[PDB]
Amino acid sequence: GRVIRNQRKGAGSIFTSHTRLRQGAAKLRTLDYAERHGYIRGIVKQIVHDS
Amino acid sequence: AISKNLPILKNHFRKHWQERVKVHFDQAGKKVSRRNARATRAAKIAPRPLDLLRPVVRAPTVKYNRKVRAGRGFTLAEVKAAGLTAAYARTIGIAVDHR
Amino acid sequence: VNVPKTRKTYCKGKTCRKHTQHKVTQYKAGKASLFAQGKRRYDRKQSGFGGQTKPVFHKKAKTTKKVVLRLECVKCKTRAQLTLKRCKHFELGGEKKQKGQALQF
Amino acid sequence: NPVDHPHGGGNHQHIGKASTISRGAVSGQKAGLIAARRTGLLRGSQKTQ
RNA sequence: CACGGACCAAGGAGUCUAACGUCUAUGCGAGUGUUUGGGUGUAAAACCCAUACGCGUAAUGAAAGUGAACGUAGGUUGGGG
RNA sequence: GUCGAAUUUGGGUAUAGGGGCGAAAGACUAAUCGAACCAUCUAGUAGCUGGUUCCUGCCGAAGUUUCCCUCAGGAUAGCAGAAGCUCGUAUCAGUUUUAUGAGGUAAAGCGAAUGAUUAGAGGUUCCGGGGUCGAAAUGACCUUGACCUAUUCUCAAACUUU
RNA sequence: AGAACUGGCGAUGCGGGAUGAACCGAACGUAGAGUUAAGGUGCCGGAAUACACGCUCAUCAGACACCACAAAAGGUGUUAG
RNA sequence: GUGAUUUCUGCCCAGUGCUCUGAAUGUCAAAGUGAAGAAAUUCAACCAAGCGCGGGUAAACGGCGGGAGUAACUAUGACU
RNA sequence: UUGACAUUGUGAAGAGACAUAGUUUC
RNA sequence: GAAGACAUUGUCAGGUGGGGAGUUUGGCUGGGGCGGCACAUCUGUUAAACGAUAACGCAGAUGUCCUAAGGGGGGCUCAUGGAGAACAGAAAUCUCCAGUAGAACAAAAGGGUAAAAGCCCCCUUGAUUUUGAUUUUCAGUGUGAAUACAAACCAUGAAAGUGUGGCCUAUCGAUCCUUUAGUCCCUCGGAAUUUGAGGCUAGAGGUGCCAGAAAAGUUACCACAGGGAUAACUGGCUUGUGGCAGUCAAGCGUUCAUAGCGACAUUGCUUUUUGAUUCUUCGAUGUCGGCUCUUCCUAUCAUACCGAAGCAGAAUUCGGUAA
Numbered sequence A: 001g002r003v004i005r006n007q008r009k010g011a012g013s014i015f016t017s018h019t020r021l022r023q024g025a026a027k028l029r030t031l032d033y034a035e036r037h038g039y040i041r042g043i044v045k046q047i048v049h050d051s
Numbered sequence B: 001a002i003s004k005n006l007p008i009l010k011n012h013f014r015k016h017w018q019e020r021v022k023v024h025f026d027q028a029g030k031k032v033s034r035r036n037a038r039a040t041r042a043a044k045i046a047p048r049p050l051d052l053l054r055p056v057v058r059a060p061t062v063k064y065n066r067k068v069r070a071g072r073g074f075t076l077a078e079v080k081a082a083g084l085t086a087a088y089a090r091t092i093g094i095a096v097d098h099r
Numbered sequence C: 001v002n003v004p005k006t007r008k009t010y011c012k013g014k015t016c017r018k019h020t021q022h023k024v025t026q027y028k029a030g031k032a033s034l035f036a037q038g039k040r041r042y043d044r045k046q047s048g049f050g051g052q053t054k055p056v057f058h059k060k061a062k063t064t065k066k067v068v069l070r071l072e073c074v075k076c077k078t079r080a081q082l083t084l085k086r087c088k089h090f091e092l093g094g095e096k097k098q099k100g101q102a103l104q105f
Numbered sequence D: 001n002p003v004d005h006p007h008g009g010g011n012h013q014h015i016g017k018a019s020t021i022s023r024g025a026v027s028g029q030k031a032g033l034i035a036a037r038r039t040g041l042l043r044g045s046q047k048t049q
Numbered sequence E: 001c002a003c004g005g006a007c008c009a010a011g012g013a014g015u016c017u018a019a020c021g022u023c024u025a026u027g028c029g030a031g032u033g034u035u036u037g038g039g040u041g042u043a044a045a046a047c048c049c050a051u052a053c054g055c056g057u058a059a060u061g062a063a064a065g066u067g068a069a070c071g072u073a074g075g076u077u078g079g080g081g
Numbered sequence F: 001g002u003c004g005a006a007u008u009u010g011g012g013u014a015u016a017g018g019g020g021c022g023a024a025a026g027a028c029u030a031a032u033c034g035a036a037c038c039a040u041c042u043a044g045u046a047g048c049u050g051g052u053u054c055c056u057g058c059c060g061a062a063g064u065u066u067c068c069c070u071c072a073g074g075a076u077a078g079c080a081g082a083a084g085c086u087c088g089u090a091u092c093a094g095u096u097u098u099a100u101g102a103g104g105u106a107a108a109g110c111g112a113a114u115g116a117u118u119a120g121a122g123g124u125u126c127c128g129g130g131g132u133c134g135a136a137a138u139g140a141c142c143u144u145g146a147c148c149u150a151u152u153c154u155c156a157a158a159c160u161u162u
Numbered sequence G: 001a002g003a004a005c006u007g008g009c010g011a012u013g014c015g016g017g018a019u020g021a022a023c024c025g026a027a028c029g030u031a032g033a034g035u036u037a038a039g040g041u042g043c044c045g046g047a048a049u050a051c052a053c054g055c056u057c058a059u060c061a062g063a064c065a066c067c068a069c070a071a072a073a074g075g076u077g078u079u080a081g
Numbered sequence H: 001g002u003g004a005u006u007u008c009u010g011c012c013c014a015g016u017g018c019u020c021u022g023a024a025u026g027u028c029a030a031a032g033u034g035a036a037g038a039a040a041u042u043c044a045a046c047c048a049a050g051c052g053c054g055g056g057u058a059a060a061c062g063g064c065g066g067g068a069g070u071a072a073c074u075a076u077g078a079c080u
Numbered sequence I: 001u002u003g004a005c006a007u008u009g010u011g012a013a014g015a016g017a018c019a020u021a022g023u024u025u026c
Numbered sequence J: 001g002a003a004g005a006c007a008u009u010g011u012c013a014g015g016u017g018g019g020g021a022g023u024u025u026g027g028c029u030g031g032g033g034c035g036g037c038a039c040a041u042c043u044g045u046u047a048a049a050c051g052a053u054a055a056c057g058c059a060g061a062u063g064u065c066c067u068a069a070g071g072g073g074g075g076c077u078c079a080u081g082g083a084g085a086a087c088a089g090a091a092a093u094c095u096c097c098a099g100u101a102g103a104a105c106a107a108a109a110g111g112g113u114a115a116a117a118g119c120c121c122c123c124u125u126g127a128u129u130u131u132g133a134u135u136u137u138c139a140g141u142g143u144g145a146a147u148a149c150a151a152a153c154c155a156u157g158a159a160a161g162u163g164u165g166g167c168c169u170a171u172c173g174a175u176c177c178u179u180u181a182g183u184c185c186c187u188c189g190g191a192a193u194u195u196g197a198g199g200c201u202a203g204a205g206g207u208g209c210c211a212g213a214a215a216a217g218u219u220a221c222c223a224c225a226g227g228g229a230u231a232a233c234u235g236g237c238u239u240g241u242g243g244c245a246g247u248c249a250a251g252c253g254u255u256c257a258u259a260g261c262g263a264c265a266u267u268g269c270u271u272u273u274u275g276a277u278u279c280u281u282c283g284a285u286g287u288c289g290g291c292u293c294u295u296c297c298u299a300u301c302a303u304a305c306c307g308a309a310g311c312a313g314a315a316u317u318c319g320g321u322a323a
């Protein structure tokens, strides 16, 4: 018979993540010279909902 | 599909054999053509003959070794004995066979 | 059935060529051997793809097998097959039938 | 319907075979409790000792 | 009270080919088959031809192999002429 | 039916055929869906259905045998035609007669064998059971059984002398 | 529904059985004359409303093989024993 | 998988599946090893996963008996 | 999925043989 | 930075793999299916006195069993019964008489058999070797089984003889391939030796759908070629079954066969029962019931006129002419 639903998922056609409104990926700072020998300061400038 | 006292036949026509029928309608034509070629070669080839001297040779196998037959060319030996090198013999309408 | 372990019968062996005593035994088999041309052709036929390439018998109906005696001339060495009717029970050991005895206990 | 799924079809709704499917199953086969090492209502306290 | 067929024209179905059995006609005959080819031509014709080859003249064995007259190529009985 | 939302809806865009898509009906995928459409392989195969085109002359069937994944089909034999060929009073015959065999059906039989079946009569017990006399009896007397003798009515595809 | 022997129908018209595959008669070139078969001869309809002895009267008579149905049982109807 | 709430959700791991820190001298491929042979080859040992053995698991698939008696009328049967 | 061979090299300790020198193998 | 000769990848090998592919999923048959086997056979009968002969006809049987239950020779006579003998009885073992087989011979049945073909004993391997001919089934193929000889070698018996499995009529198997026995024979094609392999002759391993494929289901989502050679519905033959009506008259009915009834038997009719058949229709003749509406039949429920009664009256029952 037919290809079942959970196999069709993988070709991600109608099944890809809805992404348009997202803030961007969440990530720590790239591990540079500051963060691994000292510290570096930032300001949280906005806390915000991410669809 | 088996009947009567008939001999058993083997007619191999199970492939698309009609795609591979050669009927020589061009017998007469090719003959003419073939003859014209010869008249042409003769004329081009000035006074030379249309063919080369070929050697006697005894034919192979128990069946034909009774008979003797035109060979290919003349063996480096035979030429030498006949008082000439092979490079020349070739230009004089004589076939030579190194093997 | 129970048949004798020996038997005096005809021996066809040029020198023997008479009735001589034979030792009776029961034919078996013979290991297969690849390198028989049959096994050789079969083995090739089954390589690559295509699956079983020869038939395989299933519709078994017999429940017996004709027994075959090996008869060996103690003089002239040579052997002679002879084949029995279908039977279910074959021994060629002994225990001959007895006269007219009572049933035991 | 059967075309669509291992679970499809039958004149009553039902799985017709254990829905705990092997790890080594193949695409098209893995529906239900994959690789399930137990099954049934969990009784008693969980929490990794 | 089974099926096709309202009507009319025109089209519309055992063919050709490879290899064969029986029969028959014809050529030649222990032979036979010119047409792969060559020669030649009034040019796909008609005419001519060397070497091979095919079938036949030998059979029988798995094979190695062997291989057809005792005799008026036999005796007996019927045989047309 | 529902009508402010799992709402309706345009354009753009993605997913393509053993594939998609499916709030799941085997639904939908351009009047096509339990596998779309186009061309080609392809004049696919068909033990099955239909049709198969002028005239007259002569001869003229089978539906049976055997084998077959055989039972709407084949092969085999038979029946049929054609061609003739070797001969010719000759040899021939879906017939009779005569002589000599075989047969167990129809009839018949059952006071003949096997097997069935109605009725009595006469026998026979140290011995099948009852009952009277009994201390019993291998005692006597009735009794009913079977068995026996000579009879009697009736039967047979798998009975029979004839 | 299934066998035996023969004869048929199928493959076959013709005369008869009104009608009808298989019954009766008889098998087929185109025709003239004659005679018949099976079956008929009141009229339809070719052919004696012929001859002869009986029997039969039915307010649901009867009427020709295959064949298109009738039984037990009854009658002081009538007939002959 | 089941199908709001409420309430409840029992017994069965022998079978079929799933699964495991399990055991081990049973089975078990190719290569590799040994032995015989002039070699082709033959034989043997070792031997992965798997299987077999052992354990878990039903909101996995699913399952959740039959006969005989027994109370001061009968009936019934808590009881055997 | 599991094994073998190839990609595949370098030290060290411990086993494994000509049968208690180091070439070899785990 | 992590990782490290491990992963990875490449090639073979084992496991797993309806996720997917391709395929298959007997026949006869009073439709098909379930069943049975009439599918390969045997006896008796059907079978119509040669032979042949059908049905899912009748009563049975076969896929085995036997080192003797095969082969030869001698001796003996069986089933049964009567009359006899301590314990001993219906039945133990002894003897005599009668005894045509009333027994026994693996088995189904039928044939056969008495100094045997049965029972007891003695000696045995002819249940062997070679390759042809013949009878049944038949195509005058095969297979099975069997018959009579030829050529060996044996057995038994004093011998003539007899013996080529089982007294006769059933008890079984192609081609390919494997395996074994045979002769020490042929071939491996450049020549040899040796392994190996290949031939020739005869056996075994089996096809029971038994002249001999290698084979699970489901479809109501369904498809095609056909079939009236074939079921489901009308209609046709039949009429067991269903329904209806008689004849005889033993009984019922206080008495009394027949007012009204009517056993045991027995003759029929009907075709709104159900079966049985399978002739018509499967390139289609629209199912069940109801509604509507016509007409017809009579085996008459009512209504008209009657006859009978176990008809006093009233009521009822039986019968006739009547649709």
Ligand SMILES: C[C@@H]1C[C@@H]([C@H](O)CC2CC(=O)NC(=O)C2)C(=O)[C@@H](C)C1
Pocket: C054, C055, C057, J175, J176, J177, J205, J206
């Ligand atoms: C069952 C087994 C095999 C069978 C036979 O080899 C089956 C073969 C037959 C044939 O000719 N060709 C095939 O493809 C199959 C046979 O003879 C038996 C005795 C033993």
Ligand SMILES: [Mg+2]
Pocket: A016, A017, A019
């Ligand atoms: Mg994306």
Ligand SMILES: [Mg+2]
Pocket: B012, B013, B017
């Ligand atoms: Mg060709």
Ligand SMILES: [Mg+2]
Pocket: B014, B015
């Ligand atoms: Mg082809």
Ligand SMILES: [Mg+2]
Pocket: none
């Ligand atoms: Mg061309």
Ligand SMILES: [Mg+2]
Pocket: B050, B051
């Ligand atoms: Mg030249």
Ligand SMILES: [Mg+2]
Pocket: C077, C078
């Ligand atoms: Mg030897």
Ligand SMILES: [Mg+2]
Pocket: A001, D002, D003, D005, D006
């Ligand atoms: Mg599925």
Ligand SMILES: [Mg+2]
Pocket: D006, D017
């Ligand atoms: Mg599954």
Ligand SMILES: [Mg+2]
Pocket: D006, D007, D008, D009, D010, D013, D014, D015, D016
């Ligand atoms: Mg289901």
Ligand SMILES: [Mg+2]
Pocket: D013, D014, D015
């Ligand atoms: Mg469910």
Ligand SMILES: [Mg+2]
Pocket: E003
């Ligand atoms: Mg038609």
Ligand SMILES: [Mg+2]
Pocket: none
């Ligand atoms: Mg029409």
Ligand SMILES: [Mg+2]
Pocket: none
């Ligand atoms: Mg025209």
Ligand SMILES: [Mg+2]
Pocket: E041, E042
């Ligand atoms: Mg000219």
Ligand SMILES: [Mg+2]
Pocket: B028, B029, B032, E043, E044
């Ligand atoms: Mg030209």
